[PDB]
Every structure is written in C-alpha cells, then in structure tokens.
Amino acid sequence: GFLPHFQHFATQAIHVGQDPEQWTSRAVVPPISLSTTFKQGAPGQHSGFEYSRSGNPTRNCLEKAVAALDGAKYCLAFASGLAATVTITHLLKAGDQIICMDDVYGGTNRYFRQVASEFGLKISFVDCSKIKLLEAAITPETKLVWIETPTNPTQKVIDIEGCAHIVHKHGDIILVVDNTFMSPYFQRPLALGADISMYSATKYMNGHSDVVMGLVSVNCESLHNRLRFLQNSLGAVPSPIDCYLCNRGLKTLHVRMEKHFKNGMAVAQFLESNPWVEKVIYPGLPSHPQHELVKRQCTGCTGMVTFYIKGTLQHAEIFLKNLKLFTLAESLGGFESLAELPAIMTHASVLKNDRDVLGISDTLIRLSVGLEDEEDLLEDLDQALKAAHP
Amino acid sequence: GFLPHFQHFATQAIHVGQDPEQWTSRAVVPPISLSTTFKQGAPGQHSGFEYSRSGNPTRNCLEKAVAALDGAKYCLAFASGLAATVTITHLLKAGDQIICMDDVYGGTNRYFRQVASEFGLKISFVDCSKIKLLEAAITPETKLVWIETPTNPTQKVIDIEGCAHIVHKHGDIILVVDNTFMSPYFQRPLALGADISMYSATKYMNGHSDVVMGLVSVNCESLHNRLRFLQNSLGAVPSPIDCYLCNRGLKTLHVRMEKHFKNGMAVAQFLESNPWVEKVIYPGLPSHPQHELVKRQCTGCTGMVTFYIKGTLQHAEIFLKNLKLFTLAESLGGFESLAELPAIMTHASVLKNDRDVLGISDTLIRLSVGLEDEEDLLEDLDQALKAAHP
Amino acid sequence: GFLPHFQHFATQAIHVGQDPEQWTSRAVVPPISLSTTFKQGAPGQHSGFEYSRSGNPTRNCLEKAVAALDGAKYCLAFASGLAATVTITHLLKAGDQIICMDDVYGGTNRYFRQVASEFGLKISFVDCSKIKLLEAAITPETKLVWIETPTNPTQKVIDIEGCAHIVHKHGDIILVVDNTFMSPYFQRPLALGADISMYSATKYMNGHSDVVMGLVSVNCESLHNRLRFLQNSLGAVPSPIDCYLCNRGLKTLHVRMEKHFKNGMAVAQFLESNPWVEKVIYPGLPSHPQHELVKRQCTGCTGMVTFYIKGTLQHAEIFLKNLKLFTLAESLGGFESLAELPAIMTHASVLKNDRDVLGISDTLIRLSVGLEDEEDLLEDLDQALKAAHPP
Amino acid sequence: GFLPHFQHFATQAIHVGQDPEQWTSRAVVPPISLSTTFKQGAPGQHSGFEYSRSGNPTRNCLEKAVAALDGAKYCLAFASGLAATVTITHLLKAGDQIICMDDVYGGTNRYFRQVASEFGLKISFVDCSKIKLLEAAITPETKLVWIETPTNPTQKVIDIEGCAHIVHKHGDIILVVDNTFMSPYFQRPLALGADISMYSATKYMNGHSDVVMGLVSVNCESLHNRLRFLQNSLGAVPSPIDCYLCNRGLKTLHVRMEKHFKNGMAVAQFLESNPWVEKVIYPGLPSHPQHELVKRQCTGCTGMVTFYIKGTLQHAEIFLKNLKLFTLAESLGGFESLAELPAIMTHASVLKNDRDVLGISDTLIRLSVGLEDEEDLLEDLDQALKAAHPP
Ligand SMILES: Cc1ncc(COP(=O)(O)O)c(C/N=C(\C=C\OCCN)C(=O)O)c1O
Ligand SMILES: Cc1ncc(COP(=O)(O)O)c(C/N=C(\C=C\OCCN)C(=O)O)c1O
Ligand SMILES: Cc1ncc(COP(=O)(O)O)c(C/N=C(\C=C\OCCN)C(=O)O)c1O
Ligand SMILES: Cc1ncc(COP(=O)(O)O)c(C/N=C(\C=C\OCCN)C(=O)O)c1O
Predict the structure, then answer these.
(1) Which one is the CATH code of D254-391: 1.10.8.60, 3.40.50.2000, 3.90.1150.10, 3.40.50.150?
(2) B29 touching D, CB under 8 A?
(3) How far apart are CA C303 and CA C284, in angstroms?
(4) For labelling, which of A36, C164, C173, D144 has a CA lying 20 to 30 Å from the CA of B270?
C-alpha cells in the first residue's frame, strides 16, 4: 500500500538538463565547464553566463535535473548539505525564530544551536512528529520550520502534509523538508506541501561517496529569487566537476534506490529476528510506529536502518569492530555499506540531555545498507553480533 | 626599490604539502581524494580523517602549501572568496561592528551592506588609505577591520603595518587583508601585522581561470580554532578536485607573477603616455600616489591596471568592443588578458552614489593583464583606443 | 532456464580493489592518483610504483575489480576497446594467422583487414557461430581466434565452450571473447574456456557514456606477462581519472544490467509483435536462432536489440528521425537509450559487399536500450514506427 | 647567440584553440567534454563530432594549440609518448626499414628492438650526430628515421637540417624529431626540415607530472591523413580530461621553460666546477661538444642536466639517496626537480652492451632541474655530493 511510483522519474533523471542541443558539439553528456568567466559582447548586457559562482552550464544542468525529480520549478546547488542549510537560514533576519525538528543531523543541530543563534535568531527544537506540539510552538516571530523525515538517526516520521497545513495556516512561514534519507525517488515534499525540498546530496542523490554537496528545490517565485541571490552572494557553491559527478550519480538513482530498499528491508527483518538485537527502527517494517504514515507519503523506503544492540557500549563497540563487509565510518547513502555509533560519532555534537531524551544512547547503531549482495550483508551482521555476545 | 623577494618561496610553493612519504605509493604529486568518508578503527577516536567536509588529504595539502606561502601557521580553504568572507564574518556575534575599506570588490560591499547587516552586525565603510580616518571610526564595538590593498578597482593602497598598529592598539580587533590582487609572492600581510591574509583564490593563486575558491591564512591559535570550527560547521568547502587544480596552479605562481609584473608595468607605462587615456592607476608607476609605500610593503606589482579613457561611456564601450586579444569578461588574475567596465559589470552591485564618491565612473576601465606577448598586448590596446577615438 | 547469477558479483564490484587499508587516509573510495612518477628508495629494484604508464594505484585498483568480475586472476586496462585489440594482436609475429568472427564491430574488422594485415599477419574472417567452420578454418599458423558474441550488430551467438575445445585441441591458439555486449554480469568467457575476456569498457562496463576505455582479463600466467609487457611497451594506457570513473561505473553494473535486461526484453517483445517490423534479433527471445545456447552460457540478456524495419532505407530514416526519446548516435551500453543505422554509421567501415553477405542492410537498425521508464521507451518506438508506416 | 625567440609564442599558447565563440556559453576556458558520443541530425550527418575516439572538442582544442606552437598545420594527441611512437610506426609495412638514433629513451629502444622488429620491420640503430653515418645506413627499404635531439640520456645533439637534407635526398623517407627534451618553445624541428615533430607530452609540454600523453605535429597533407586514420583506427587516444590538463599546462610553458633554462644553467655550471663530478653534459655549456649547433638550431636550453659522478655505482646511489629537494624518481620536465640513474632505471630496457657503447654507465646521473629556488637546488646537490664524497 505504498504511494505509486512517480511517473517518468527515470526518464527525467536521465534526460532533463541533458539536451544535446545546448552544446555546439551536440554531446549526449553535458561537458564539464570549469571556466570562471565568459566572454561578453557588450558591458552590462544580460545575455548569457558571466561568472561561474553566479551561474555556469554544468551546475545549471544539474539544477534542472534535480528540480524535475523533486517536481520543482527550480533548484539551487551548494557546496554541502550544511551550506545549503546556512544559505536557507540567511533568508531570515535578526529577531526571527526558527523551529527545528528535535531529532536531526548533529551538524544541523550544532549549526542552529551554536552559530545561527549568535546572530539574533531564536532556535526552538520541537518534536514535530506530534503535529499539535508544532502548532503550540509557532509564534509571530516564527519564519522557518526545519524538519527531517525520517529523522537522523532515530528515524521519527513526520506527517509532511499535516505539518504544511499547520505551518501555512497563519503568517509567512517557510517549511523545509530535508529529504536526504529518502531521496526524491521515494518522497516528494513539495508535492506534500513543503516550501523547500533540501538534500545533503552527499548521500543518496550522488550515491557514490565521492561528492560533498547540498541541493535546494523550490516552487515559490519570490522564495527562489531570495535563495538565488544568496547562492551568488554568500558563494557557498559547488565545483562544476562535482556538479557533473552528482548529475552522473543521478542517472542511476532509481535503480540504486530500489536495491537500497530491497537490501535495507532484508537487513531490518534480519535484525528484528535476531536474539542479540533489542529493537529495530525501519520505516518499511510494520513495527515502525509510523509505518502506515510512511506508506501514505512515500513510494518505498531506503537503506537506512537503525537498531539498538543488546548489552552496553562495549557490546556496541565489539559489534562494530567485527564487521568485515560493512565499514565503520560516518556518512550514508553510498553504494558501500556503512555502520556507525551516532552518540559517539555523527551526533556527538548533540547535547547529552537531548541525546537521552531522543534515545540516542550508547547502544543505538545506524546502518546505511549499500548495494552489495544481500547474503553477504546478512552474514556480516550475523557474525559481528555473535562476536559481540560470546 | 621594492622589498626583497621572500626567500625559498618557489621551493615552498612546489614542495610544502607535497611530501611523497604521505602516500603509500610515494606519489610525487598528491592523489585527488574524493572519498566523502574514511574507515575508523574504533568508534569516536580522532587519529585520522573522518569526513571530507571536516578535512581531507587533498584540501589539507593545499592549505599547508598556502599557509607556507603566506608565512602562516595555518590556512583554511573555502568554496569561493565570498564564502571565505562569509565564514570570517561568522567569527563575530550580534552587536559587533565591522569597518570595511570603502573601495572593495562589489560582492564584498554587497555582502556586508545587504546581508551581514541584517543579522545584528553594524557595517561602516571607511577610507582606510587615510589612517587618520580608520583611527576615528573605531568604536568599542568594532571587532573586525576588512581591507583590500590595492583596492578593487581604484587601487588605493593601504599601509598594512600602520593600520595593524592602529587597530591592535585598541582592544581585540581582527585585521583582515584581502590579498587577492597582490598574491603572497608580492605581499605578505601577516608579516606586516595583519591577523588574516585572505584570498579569492579564483584569481592569481589558482591563476588559470578554472577554479572558484577562497583561502584564509592565519597565525593566532584561537583565531584558527574558531575559523576551523566554522569551516566544518558552515560547510562552505571546496571540492577536493578544485583543491588539486589550485595546488597545481600554485606550482607556477612565482613565474606567472613575475610575468604579470613585466606585462602589467609595460601596459601601465603605455597607457599613461597614450593620448586617449586621462589617468592610469598602477602601483608600480611613480604617478601612483602610494608608489613609495608600495615599494616599502611589496616585493613587486601585478597585472591589474586601472585607467580612465578620455571621453564618455560610449568611448569606453567602443574601446572594449574593439579589443581582439584582451577579452571583455569579468574576473582577473588568469593567464589570459581580461578587460571590463566595473561600474556596469563587477561593481554594479555598488550603489551608484558610492561609485561616484569612489570615482568608479563610466570611463573607469580595469585590465587584468595576462601572460601573452607584450607587443601583442600593447598593439591590441593601441588599435582599440584608436577605434574609440578615430 | 538461464545459468544462475554469479555469486558475490555486487559485493566484489563494490569492494574488490577498494580496501581502505591501502591508503594512509583509510579512504573508503580510492583516491585518483594522477602522478606520473613516484619517489624510489631503491634504484634498480622494482618494489614500488615507478611510472604511471607502467602501473599506478587508480588503474591497478580498477584492474583488480574487473578481474574479479570476470573470475580472472589478472586484468589490464587500455585507452579504448580498439587499443585493447591492437595490444592483444601484438602478442603475435609476422607469419601468424588470425581468425576473426565474420560479424564484428566495424573498427575491429577494419583494423585486422587494413592494418594488421600489412605487418605479416594473415587474416581470415569465419562464421564461428558454426563450430565446424572454425574447425575447418584452423591452419598450423593460426595463433589467435577473435570472437564477439553476440556479434555487433547482427547478434549471432557463438558457443564459447565449443570453440574453446576446438581451438585448444590444436594447441597454442589464443581464444579471445570480446564480451562488450553482455558484460561480465551476464557472461563469463573465461569460465567457458576462453583465454581472454575483452571489453570496450566504453560501453556497459563504465556505462555512463563518458569514458573511452578497453579492458582485457586473463588467467594464464605466461599470457598475462606478455600482455603486461605490451601494456607498458606500447603505452596505449588509460588516464587514471578515466580509470576512476570506470571503476565508479562498475559499482552500479549489477543494478544497471538488470534494468537493461528488463527494458531490452520489453522493447524486443514489443518490436517482434509490431506489424511494421520485419524481424527482431534478441538473444532473450525464443525466436532467436541461438536462444537455447544463450540460456546455456549466459545468466541473462542486455539492452542491445537489433531489428529490420519493413520497407526501405527511407522508412528506417523516417523512423529514426521521429524518435523523441531514443537518441540517434553511435555507441551503446550507457544509461541513455540510443538508436543507429549500422550500414551508414558504426559499420560504414565494413566493405559494402561484406555488409551484404552479413545482412547489415539499409533496414537493419540497432538499439541500445537504456534505463529510462519502460512505458516511455515503448511509446517512443510505437509512434516512430507509425510515422514511418512502411508497406 | 641563440636563435631569436619564436614570435607570438605566448599569445598562441594561451589563445589558439581557445576561442570563446566555439561554445554556446562563450566560456573563456574550453569545457571538458567527456561524452563518448554525440547526437546526429540524421544517419551519418553529424554536427562535427561522431564519437570521442575519432575526435572530441577538448582534444581538438589541444591539438590546434600544439600545432601552432610547433608552427605546424596539424597535430594529433595520443595516450602516451610510446603510443605516439607506435602509431607513427604503423605508417610503415612489412619489409620497411627504420633507422633510430643510437641513443634514445629506453622504451623507444625496446619498442623498435623487441616489438616492431617482430612484424617484418628492419631496425638499425645509428649515431646520427655523425651525418655520414646516417647516410651510409640508408637503404632502398628505409622509410623512417627516428631521432631525439638532445638524446635521452647522453644528450648528443643532431643537426636536424643537415639530416633532413640527407634523408630527403634519398627519396620518400619520413624524418621524425622527438622534441620532448626541448619543447617547441626552444626548438622547432618542422622549421628545420623534419616531417614530424613528436613529444612525450608527459614531460615539459604538460609540465606538471600529472598527465601521461603523446603529441605528433605534422605539415604534410598525406602524412596527416595517414596518421589521423591510425589515431582513430588504433585508438591509442588520450582522455579528454588529460587533454584539458595538458592544454592548461601549455599556458605556462613559456614562463616555465625560461625558468628551467636559468636553473638548469646554474646547476650545470655548479656541477662542472665541483670536485666530486667527473664530467658534465649540458647543451648550454661551452664544454658540450655540440654547443655551437645547439645555439644555431635552438632559442635556449632546458632543465635536463646529465653528469658523471666520480667513483662507482655505490657513490652514485649514495648521492641520489641523500638528495633532500631533488626527488629520486623517473620521468622529467615537471615543476619539481628529479634525479635518476638511467642504466638501472629508465634505460635498463637498453641492452647492457648497447649501454656501454653509448656511455650509459653506472655513474651517469640524469637531473631534471625544476622550478624551485636556485640556491636551494644548488645547496641540495652540494650536500648530497659531500655525502657520497668519491675520489
Ligand atoms: C539528514 C542530513 N542533512 C544534512 C546533512 C549535512 O550534509 P553535508 O553538509 O554533510 O553534505 C547530513 C549529514 N549527515 C551525516 C554526515 C556526517 O558527517 C560527519 C560529521 N558529523 C551523517 O553521517 O549522518 C544529514 O544526514
Ligand atoms: C578582491 C576580491 N575579493 C574577493 C572576491 C570574491 O571572490 P570569489 O567569491 O569570486 O572567489 C573578489 C571577486 N572579484 C571579481 C569577481 C567578479 O565576478 C562576479 C560578479 N561581480 C572581480 O572580477 O572583480 C575580489 O576581486
Ligand atoms: C563489440 C565492440 N568491441 C570493441 C569496440 C571498440 O571499442 P572502442 O575502441 O570504441 O572503445 C566496439 C566499438 N563499438 C561501437 C563504436 C562506435 O564508434 C564510432 C565509430 N564507428 C559501436 O557503437 O558499435 C565494439 O562494439
Ligand atoms: C625523449 C622521450 N621520448 C618518449 C618517451 C616516452 O613517453 P611516455 O610513453 O613515457 O609518455 C620518453 C619517456 N621518458 C622517460 C620515461 C620514464 O618512464 C619509466 C620507464 N622508463 C624518462 O624518464 O626518461 C622520453 O624521454
């Protein structure tokens, strides 16, 4: 009972922005234009490219492609997911209030809490997975609501349309959905009411663990113009080569994501029947408390699997160190399988008390299940878990 | 009469950061490491790389090299010069004041005036080429002084040592020198008393018009810690590949800059004796009002030449359109000769009344003299001036 | 009834040659080492890297991965598919005979026929889809037997094990299978008895239409050493950056190939029941004359679909011009769907009378079916054939 | 008293092939086009490019640039210097004879001696610095004369114009000058009567020790057509990214080479008055036997310096291992200073007897003087020689 798959996604992934008639050569694959600058026929004419930071062919093609996948009119590429976040935050002004989902990427939490807040911005962390708590937290000063769904790393799921409805009822408030964990193949926040669909393109979008990049998709004309002004003005922009690599990565997004789904489901089911696993959190399992909502707003699920190992931090460490195919490393969304302990690694930057409230304990482990053979991945988890409880 | 050239500069540019012993293969040129993430031996210990945004081999090699050329302990690389400015500005907090050199790159002007100033930062533009005016403008809230020298585009020259003394006498104020126009081959702000030596590496540093990048060199330990936190936390970071190309650009910086000097001087001398030129501003000309100061704090001069054409905007435009070797385009500091009209191009983002007070008029033309044959460059300027004045 | 898929393929494609422990940084993805040269501690002893052309980490990492995917001990990367052919041909010497499959890529034809033949090498083109013909064509001077299966573009299928048995009965004769059309995901010539498995990596291996490259995988120690000598000595070597890009492409080879199969089969089934198609040639269709053999030596089929449109060259040209999704262009094996007319494009380099004999006529169209939505591809083909509506 | 410098060289290096009007974006630097294939308006009717191996925008831009710098009509780029050599040799046919300079890069030696010779090609190695010897070596079968000047590594200098007169007097013989050591900034073989000017672009041309590549410049129309055929048909082609990086390298070629000249001259003179040094071979020194010829056919000299250390192999090894700034490594022509012992490294591929005849002993050391500070370079050589301190 998942949402039906988005029509023409693959066709668009491979072709939007990639029209050969853009190039004098009629190249089937867009060239990588590194050039910082472009010849102009007259001073002050507004006909064509001018300066790479402001706009450049390879970035522009990638932005077109991503926009289409998001069902968006526009998209803006950035130097990283965090830099996308920073740029979006600069839409605001001193005196403004930001509401942020209480469970998010550690660095996002850090940015709002320790940086943005220093500049006249008030930050409230709210469990938006309970729509009425969101409602209760909105103030006349609220200008931005930042959510992940599923959240990193406890994978709480948020009713995007329900949040949209509440957020847009009064005033002028921007709803951002960081769609990093799902990719637009599986979830389209703009279709559900968000004003912005945002990515760490570093993860599934590129999918090849070799590009650090952020993406921001948007429909609203005024909102886009404001964002485009800041892309140019803050200059947190991606290399044109990275744009090329990410675009290239996009061409297999659909077949990569389907295999992440299959492998992730297999891993989740395996862990849930494992005697050395205390609890599994995976949107595609009925055991996930928002599983039905997941099927309502998503076309499938990804490779991210969270689980609590039995025992203590020491068991968690022995498990991680015994993995032979999963790699103990940060990040996610690549072809290769990764494994992490968020409380000590990606989410060390989250306050202890917040970690405890959120349940990011010493025994919470986060998996990014890759595209390897399913049997090899299950064998690796099986032996590492036995190694941990001898 | 210039400062003696900095010793070992070429040796350092070619070898700092490039030690083959860093790589298991003993490669003489550092590999390009795109990997977003790195395998860790145990959860949460910090004895290697962890995530590309935070640090990565190719970026770290570049930073090491640039720090050396600046005579600095540390350097941080960014996605663009503007992103370097953005990151430095995040060192501050609401309530703080910034003094900016009155003549700067249009985008820098724009960032402080229209963006930074919305987040609790007060911005004052001051002609710091008159140290008296800088002294008067410092308040108890001043935390940062941003200068360019020579300025873009009217090439006013600031006494860096003099300003450092004024700024550091009073409290804890950061002095930044945007050293984009001179490069570290010709000027070392940190040796002169500046706290930060900053670049749009997009220009001479890379030197090849195919990389957008910022660079920030510093000595002070806590200033570095704060900047490094912001590199990682705002994530306005460069591609490892771009880092490679910039590093590669650096291996010829010395021989490129010496040729920029000779060509620049020859072009400046030619224009000044040309009957269709009203005024030439080139720090290497005795006519430059700070010529003696330039020899006191620089080892030589670059290829940036500013001049005013006799006549009106129509004459400037006809000149620019009849250039056949110089290219009508924005940016600077490449091997290829570039020409532009700042009022209508790079500095259109400066308010027209500021442009008039600064002298950035319809007839101010900025040249970035490249590395082509001298006689070819002079002949192009000659015929184009005649074209504008038949 | 296809052969079972090869075990641990995806695991190997993603991890072989990619061990983080190779690098001081412990990078999960191998760095791109551009460096031409390497600091040595031992002049005259070959215990480290020395010179990029001879060997370098990014190429070596790639070669290891491909070798594993081929079930091979060794693999050598080259500047292009044709460069791999040229290097393999340098294994021989004046007075040797090459036997080449009568239907091969036009440039392979051209190279043997117009170039190799000028340097003391006898070339015979033989229909090796008939084993008796190979058998009867072998002479005492035969040193090399070069096959494609399925052939480009008429897609005759060759019994690899049967030819291997025939060829090795005579002794020192190298059997090469150019496995460009299948990829190691669907066909493993080395497990079938071939001495060499070769690729234009430009096609499916890389898969992203942005790298020109050749690959040669081998088991024999002696044969490997001879090929490695020629990799170094002829220097038709690929850029380490290209090597990085191809190896990146490898990591989606399994999921790419499965979708090419799905899309290819659907395209083939649609064309075969279309009133405007004369004949379809697709290994996965029961109508294919070697279908049973395909199932016996392959684990599946790819996106390469060949067919004859009814009518004349004019109908082929109206069909091609009306395609809105398929792109008229040479090459194959990329994420993007392509169509071409071999007689005028990729196989213009085959002499017209040879073209006639092989059936590469003015109505032969070759499709490389990409990874787009099936429905969209089928619709594109449908409306383009209606545009042409030949008698 | 050198040749006056070639006019507009820098202007051409920076702009030839780089016209912004080529690109819809009007980019000042040509884009890197990785695309293997290109959309056609109709079968066999393309917009200029068909397939990357055959031609691509980024390679063509580079080829145009290099041709200009050589003063040539045409240029072809290849995967490596060896691959350019292989491709040129394919111009010939069984029964043809090749004369090769007796002192050349070891791989060039090896290719002719062990590979080319196996395919009906006769190889003669001849000291062409004595023109009567070349003339005596010419037979009716002679079709190709391959010279380096200065030679790698003993830097014998050949009278290119003298040799052109002799060779062309005797009929349709192709004279190739491998101009790797000099670069077209300092030497133009085509203006001196050579038919081909050839490079390992891997060295000074790229200049940055991060690209393996070959280049071939040529004026003769029929010669161009034949080479172009072989570029496409053999496929020993460079990555477009490598082409980009090589073009990028070119734009600093003039300022790089002037500095290689200054530093190289300083190193040569330092070595020549050093007590632990037996002999120095540098074209820029009056002590070089062909110094006066060097000034007649060149506009300056490069960073390649050859010397004999006093003592034995032991002493040469200790010298090399004690270098702190020079890097003990192969290759040459980079920004970074390199040092090697040819007899057991780059020229181990030369037969030991041939090595003795040529003077490539265990004490011949080859320096590639890079662009570092002169005093640091000299200081490094000084402490290293002191470290070995032979008799
Ligand atoms: C959901 C989400 N949004 C935004 C970002 C920031 O994107 P970036 O700037 O890195 O492109 C991340 C990074 N997520 C991780 C990155 C970790 O890096 C290690 C430093 N904590 C992770 O492993 O969970 C993320 O998981
Ligand atoms: C002195 C100086 N500092 C910083 C920057 C910003 O660096 P970036 O973010 O571009 O790396 C520039 C850009 N200067 C120019 C760039 C212009 O193009 C953009 C349109 N204004 C110029 O040509 O004057 C600069 O000239
Ligand atoms: C089966 C096969 N082997 C080898 C090659 C040569 O590989 P390369 O050198 O291109 O990497 C090809 C090229 N096949 C095609 C090449 C077309 O190129 C255009 C020039 N005809 C094709 O589309 O059929 C091929 O199809
Ligand atoms: C004059 C000359 N021509 C051609 C080549 C071959 O070009 P390539 O295929 O490498 O692009 C070389 C290589 N020269 C050296 C190559 C060393 O490689 C290591 C093995 N010899 C050298 O250091 O002397 C050369 O010096």
Answers:
(1) 3.90.1150.10
(2) yes
(3) 10
(4) A36
